[PDB]
Design a binder for this molecule. Sequence first.
Ligand SMILES: Nc1ncnc2c1ncn2[C@@H]1O[C@H](COP(=O)(O)OP(=O)(O)OP(=O)(O)O)[C@@H](O)[C@H]1O
Ligand SMILES: Nc1ncnc2c1ncn2[C@@H]1O[C@H](COP(=O)(O)OP(=O)(O)OP(=O)(O)O)[C@@H](O)[C@H]1O
Ligand SMILES: [Mg+2]
Ligand SMILES: [Mg+2]
Ligand SMILES: [Mg+2]
Lengths: 73, 73
Amino acid sequence: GELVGIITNRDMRFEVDQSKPVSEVMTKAPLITAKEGVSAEAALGLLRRHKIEKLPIVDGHGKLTGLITVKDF
Amino acid sequence: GELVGIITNRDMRFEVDQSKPVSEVMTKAPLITAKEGVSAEAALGLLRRHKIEKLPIVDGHGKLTGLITVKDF
Ligand SMILES: Nc1ncnc2c1ncn2[C@@H]1O[C@H](COP(=O)(O)OP(=O)(O)OP(=O)(O)O)[C@@H](O)[C@H]1O
Ligand SMILES: Nc1ncnc2c1ncn2[C@@H]1O[C@H](COP(=O)(O)OP(=O)(O)OP(=O)(O)O)[C@@H](O)[C@H]1O
Ligand SMILES: [Mg+2]
Ligand SMILES: [Mg+2]
Ligand SMILES: [Mg+2]
């Protein structure tokens, strides 16, 4: 359950081989992540500062728990 | 005319004080740029290498000449 990467449209927009494994093209860890229970304003600040769109939210061990984005609102 | 930066949707997406100048909310030089007459596949390779949707095409002096984007490809 520990995070090892992330994949988005910018990571695979023009990739030719659809057989490419996730580990081959994913954005390698470490990444910009927050802890469980992180405040919404802190998440917005991280999103604006790092200009990443999908911010993962991690537990106190390294296993992913959630993802923060205002689009649900 | 010296290309000193670039401002895209992400920089200005969630800014509140819209009265701020561009230089305060722009990505400053040096940018990821290519020479005039750069090959299409070379430009695509650079775009995927930096995973950025804008590529300024500049003269050797650094004067802006053109704007390649990822959605054209
Ligand atoms: N939280 C993060 N920390 C670090 N890098 C990230 C994070 N989220 C995404 N990235 C990386 O940033 C790059 C762009 O991801 P982003 O989420 O901005 O793309 P997207 O949502 O698909 O955007 P677009 O609509 O422009 O395609 C990719 O290389 C991706 O792996
Ligand atoms: N040539 C470049 N070199 C370096 N950084 C750049 C370059 N062009 C744009 N940037 C910056 O890289 C970031 C991402 O660029 P990109 O063009 O993917 O964003 P965008 O098109 O506004 O994104 P979206 O479509 O997801 O809203 C922005 O902060 C932008 O200012
Ligand atoms: Mg996007
Ligand atoms: Mg765009
Ligand atoms: Mg886009």
